């Protein structure tokens, strides 16, 4: 049985710009027992029927995780626009996997969480950018932040206790499935 508890029930989660990857391998994955957490505000899948997940096998499964805002969870999906999906975490158009999200104001309100506002270009799918070099609007990067037109590219989220649910922290975990010409490492109950 796959260690889904250690991903979803983890005490700490990454900033979306510094999203973490965990590898699920050599285990049986009953996704329907993962569902039963009614805390899930979001549970959508792409390229696979969620009923049919119990009978599929994959060569490699990854579990990426991050903290974004309620009104940004919609951006964690294929072929989407936004500051998160273009500078923090991008998904391929042919994405095969699932996106799960839940409200985490209980654990992440008053938490040091960041996202990337400025970038020279959009992320390639599954790219990660941990750079903290100053961004020059019209200027060259690496300029002095005290000067004008020069900003730090990473901004804190500010998950105050009075904001609307659209602004509160939500923890997202993205399971991505792939099966190539390689042996299987993850299988459902029906196809063990």
């Amino acid at each position: 049985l796959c260690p889904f508890s250690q991903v979803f029930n983890a005490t700490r989660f990454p900033s979306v710009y510094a999203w973490t990857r965990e590898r699920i391998s050599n285990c049986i994955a009953d996704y329907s027992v993962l569902y039963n957490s009614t805390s899930f505000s979001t549970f959508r899948c792409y390229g696979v029927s969620p009923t049919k997940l119990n009978d599929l096998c994959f060569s490699n499964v990854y579990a990426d995780s991050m903290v974004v805002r309620g009104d940004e969870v919609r951006q964690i999906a294929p072929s989407q626009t936004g500051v998160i999906a273009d500078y923090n975490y991008k998904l391929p158009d042919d994405f095969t996997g699932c996106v799960i999200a839940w409200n985490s104001k209980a654990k992440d309100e008053n938490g040091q969480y960041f996202y990337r506002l400025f970038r020279k270009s959009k992320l390639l799918p599954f790219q990660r950018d941990v750079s903290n070099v100053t961004y020059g609007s019209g200027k060259n990067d690496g300029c002095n932040p005290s000067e004008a037109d020069c900003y730090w590219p990473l901004l804190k989220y500010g998950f105050t206790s009075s904001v609307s649910q659209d602004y509160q922290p939500y923890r997202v975990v993205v399971l991505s499935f792939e099966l190539l010409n390689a042996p299987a490492t993850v299988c459902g109950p029906k196809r063990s």
Partner: nanobody
Framework: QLQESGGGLVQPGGSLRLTCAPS????????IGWFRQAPGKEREGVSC???????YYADSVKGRFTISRDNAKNTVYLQMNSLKPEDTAVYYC?????????????????????WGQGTQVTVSS
């Protein structure tokens, strides 16, 4: 932008048809959901349909509510039949781009960025 019509006052067991109407875009490559918000309580997802024509329904409405898209008439209607008092709330429709097909295990407000203003639905006698 989404325009919503069809709500109103209905006796227990009656019928209602909620309409959701897009302006300025086509619902062909979009996913549309119907959401209700009772007084105080949080926006619950009632029924959603993706471009896949794959659908979701809340467990409490499963046998009684029906979502449908008219990709030619650019309308998405929720048929609300066998109405219960528990069904009284403000109903919003929502729309999200869905260029690749979505499959919902659940449907939530966290899944849509465009919303309507709401229609009031009341089931009483």
């Amino acid at each position: 932008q989404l325009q919503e019509s069809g709500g109103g006052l209905v006796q227990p067991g009656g019928s209602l048809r909620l309409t959701c109407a897009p302006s300025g875009f086509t619902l062909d490559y979009y996913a549309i959901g119907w959401f209700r918000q009772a007084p105080g309580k949080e926006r619950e997802g009632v029924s959603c349909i993706s471009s896949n024509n794959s659908t979701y329904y809340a467990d409490s409405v499963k046998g009684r509510f029906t979502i449908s898209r008219d990709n030619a008439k650019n309308t998405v209607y929720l048929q609300m039949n066998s109405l219960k008092p528990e069904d009284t709330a403000v109903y919003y429709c929502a729309a999200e781009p869905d260029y690749s097909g979505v499959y919902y295990y659940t449907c939530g407000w966290t899944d849509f960025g465009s919303w309507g203003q709401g229609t009031q639905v009341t089931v009483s006698s």
